């Protein structure tokens, strides 16, 4: 859901005139608040891997075997890395 | 000439821009069912409109990971220490600014001037409820900012080198010294003036920021194309007081005043004028994108060329000769910062084409002869360095004929004197 | 989707342009004939411009890769990442429906180690520099390499050149420099 809260989307959607099946997808127990809206339906890990579909603002989701299921992560830039630096050294 | 100077300049380049997706039936029935019931006997002029819009929306992501995720090893700033007298800090990012950006970029963000759901319950609430909404980027400003900090502190630590294969530390001084050597200059000529080349770098540096502190129409290019992708959505929404030959520009004034038979003549009226609105607007974002496509495209390359490398190609890279590039970031954008050799105050000389010593024709290996009135000597062409014509200096090819200015003078054995 | 376009009635009372002329007089037929005319010149219109506006990028696919392959393989260029990653030396093309493949050819380094440098060397009075490649040290000796490459020599008179005295160079270290005709 673009641009509302997380406990404002029963009231967004109006969630009371739905299908108890689409009715699923507005309540608690995996709703998660990322900086471009609310996902409902993805369980949130907090490891970095490659973006496999992009949903926006530095979050990607995925479908893990954990036995099966949509995961939401922050995508990561690359491997960190570091440079030995002096003002006397030099690498050949 | 003599003396030289080192000038930093600044490029600005546009590189995406906003990402939109329109509702086809709420913009133009909103939440009728005598409309949208209608429209269904209309084509389908609704899918290809987002077919559209999402081949524009998905391509400005691919803009920014070509410019900015040139390396994909995020190396890391090390300890600021001694870089020769160079003094990098209002570059590289500070601890305690927000959001590890560093002081250039603060200026920068400010310059340029770009709503929950239970705020609209003005102006974007209004296009809200017609279906028009604007999508975020896949790359957050803080994330940008990580990519620029590692391309602008493997370049200060390394060189040329990690952006063909792995990262090989080398000392700055080390390293200004063969950037030197590649624009004609000598070795010596920055080792022997390694502080007034330090302090005219920082000097340099510390009058872009005053340029930027004081002059609203710096980041002009930036603002124009934000302008614009706003006033479009304006325009779309401004669309919708027009009745397009029909008896009212309100749907629910033709719906409560003439019955079905006698409505659909206006409703398809009203239907028609409303999706042309849409296909202009859609035509029109598809033949912006196709230049931002192409900024995008030049930065790439400028970034490639100019900030991993050191360019032969003549004012690609600033004014003057090239020695270096630093990036920052900017929104929808980056700024390249160039740092260039220019020469300075010059003087007159006499010169001459060979020299005819006893029957031979010495030419310069390098650099060229001059005359200080009533002796010869070699210099390079670049900066005024004289010495003394030897057999070390010059290579002898025929006999004094066929040069046409030919000057007499002598050459001087190094191991006759042995 | 121009064609399955011909299925819609653009307010007419039918999509088939036969069962308006089998069931209406000229006069009343008119009228839904020019309204299906009408929709379906948007249709060709709409075409025409997305064709429009799609071969303009395939125009500057094609002038890139005439560029890359007047620049790659007709000669060698030393634009960095322009024909490939590394250090470019050669490049083949072979030919693909609708397009072109290029097969890059690099010199990539490898294993690298570590060494002790210094910018120039203070022999008696007088700073040496280098003229190609850079000094290095195994920790006891001097000597000179090429920078892409360890193939170490030894400090002679032609693999250096004099300029000035060791004062203002910062980093200078002192050494000895062989001169090759000294034994003769
Ligand atoms: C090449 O040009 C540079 C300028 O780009 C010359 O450097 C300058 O040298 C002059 C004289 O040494 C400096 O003037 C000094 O100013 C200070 C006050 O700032 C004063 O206390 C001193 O008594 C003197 O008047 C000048 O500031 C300095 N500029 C820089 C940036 O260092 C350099 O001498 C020229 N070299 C040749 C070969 O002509
Ligand atoms: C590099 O330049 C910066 C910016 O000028 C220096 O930071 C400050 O500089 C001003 C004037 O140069 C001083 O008054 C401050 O005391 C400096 N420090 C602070 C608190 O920011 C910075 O010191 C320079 N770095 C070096 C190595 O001298
Ligand atoms: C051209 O340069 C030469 C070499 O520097 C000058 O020759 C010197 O002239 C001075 C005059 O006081 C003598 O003391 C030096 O012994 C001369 N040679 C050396 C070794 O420097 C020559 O005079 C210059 N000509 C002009 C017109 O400036
Ligand atoms: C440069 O040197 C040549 C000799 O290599 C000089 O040429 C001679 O010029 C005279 C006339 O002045 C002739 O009689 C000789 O035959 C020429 N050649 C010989 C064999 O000496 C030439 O004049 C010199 N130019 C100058 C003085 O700048
Ligand atoms: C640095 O390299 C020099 C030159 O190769 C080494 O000097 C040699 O050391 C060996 C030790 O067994 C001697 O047998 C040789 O005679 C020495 N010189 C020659 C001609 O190769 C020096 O030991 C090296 N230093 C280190 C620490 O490896
Ligand atoms: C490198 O060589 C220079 C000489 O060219 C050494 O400089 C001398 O240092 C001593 C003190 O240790 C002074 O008393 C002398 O006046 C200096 N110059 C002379 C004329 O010898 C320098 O120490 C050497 N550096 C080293 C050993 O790495
Ligand atoms: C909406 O979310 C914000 C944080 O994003 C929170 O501060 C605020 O209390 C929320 N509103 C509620 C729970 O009504
Ligand atoms: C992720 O980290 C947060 C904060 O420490 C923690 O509350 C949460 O349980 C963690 N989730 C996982 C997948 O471990
Ligand atoms: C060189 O000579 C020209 C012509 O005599 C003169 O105009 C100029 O001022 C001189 N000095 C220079 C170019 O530095
Ligand atoms: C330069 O031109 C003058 C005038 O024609 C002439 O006398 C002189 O010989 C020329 N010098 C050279 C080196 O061509
Ligand atoms: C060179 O030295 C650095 C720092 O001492 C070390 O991390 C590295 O492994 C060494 N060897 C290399 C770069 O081959
Ligand atoms: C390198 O830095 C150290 C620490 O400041 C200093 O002692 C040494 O003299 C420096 N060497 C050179 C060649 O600058």
């Known amino acids: ?92 | 000439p003599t003396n030289f100077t080192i000038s930093v300049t600044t490029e600005i380049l546009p590189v995406s821009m906003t990402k939109t997706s329109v509702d086809c039936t709420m913009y133009i029935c909103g939440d009728s069912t005598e409309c949208s019931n209608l429209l269904l006997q209309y084509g389908s002029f609704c899918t290809q409109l987002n077919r559209a819009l999402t081949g524009i929306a998905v391509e400005q992501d691919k803009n920014t990971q070509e410019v900015f995720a040139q390396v994909k090893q995020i190396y890391k700033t090390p300890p600021i220490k001694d870089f020769g007298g160079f003094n990098f800090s209002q570059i590289l990012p500070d601890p305690s600014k927000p959001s590890k950006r560093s002081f250039i970029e603060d200026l920068l963000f400010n310059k340029v001037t770009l709503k929950q759901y239970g705020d609209c319950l003005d102006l974007i609430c209004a296009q809200k409820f017609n279906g028009l909404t604007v999508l975020p980027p896949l790359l957050t400003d803080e994330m940008i900012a990580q990519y620029t900090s590692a391309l602008l502190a493997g370049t200060i630590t390394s060189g040329w080198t990690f952006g063909a294969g792995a990262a090989l530390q080398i000392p700055f001084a080390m390293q200004m010294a063969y950037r030197f050597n590649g624009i004609g200059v000598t070795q010596n000529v920055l080792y022997e003036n390694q502080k007034l080349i330090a302090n005219q770098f920082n000097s340099a540096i510390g009058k872009i920021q005053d340029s930027l502190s004081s002059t609203a129409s710096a980041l002009g290019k930036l603002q124009d194309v934000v302008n614009q992708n706003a006033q479009a959505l304006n325009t779309l929404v401004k669309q919708l007081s027009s009745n397009f030959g029909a008896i009212s520009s309100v749907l629910n004034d033709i719906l409560s005043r003439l019955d079905p038979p006698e409505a659909e003549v206006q409703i398809d009226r009203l239907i028609t004028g409303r999706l042309q609105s849409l296909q202009t607007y859609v035509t029109q974002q598809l033949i912006r994108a196709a230049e931002i496509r192409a900024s995008a495209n030049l930065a790439a390359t400028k970034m490639s060329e100019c900030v991993l490398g050191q360019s032969k190609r003549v004012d690609f890279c600033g004014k003057g000769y090239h020695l270096m590039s630093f990036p920052q970031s900017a929104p929808h954008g980056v700024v390249f910062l160039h740092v260039t050799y220019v020469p300075a105050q010059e003087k007159n000389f006499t010169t001459a084409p060979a020299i005819c010593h006893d029957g031979k024709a010495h030419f310069p290996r390098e650099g060229v002869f001059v005359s200080n009135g009533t002796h010869w000597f070699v210099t390079q062409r670049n900066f005024y360095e004289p010495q003394i014509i030897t057999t070390d200096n010059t290579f002898v090819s025929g006999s004094c004929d066929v040069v046409i200015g030919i000057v007499n003078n002598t050459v001087y054995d190094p191991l006759q004197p042995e």
Do not use: K
């Open chain 1, 1 to 92: 859901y673009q641009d509302v809260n997380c406990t404002e989307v029963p009231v967004a959607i109006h969630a009371d005139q739905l299908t108890p099946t689409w009715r699923v997808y507005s309540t608690g127990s995996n709703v998660f608040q990322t900086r471009a809206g609310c996902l409902i339906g993805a369980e949130h890990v907090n490891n970095s891997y490659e973006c496999d579909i992009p949903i926006g603002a530095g979050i990607c989701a995925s479908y893990q075997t954990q036995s099966q299921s949509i995961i939401a992560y922050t995508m990561s830039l690359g491997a960190e890395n570091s440079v030995a630096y002096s003002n006397n050294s030099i690498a050949i």
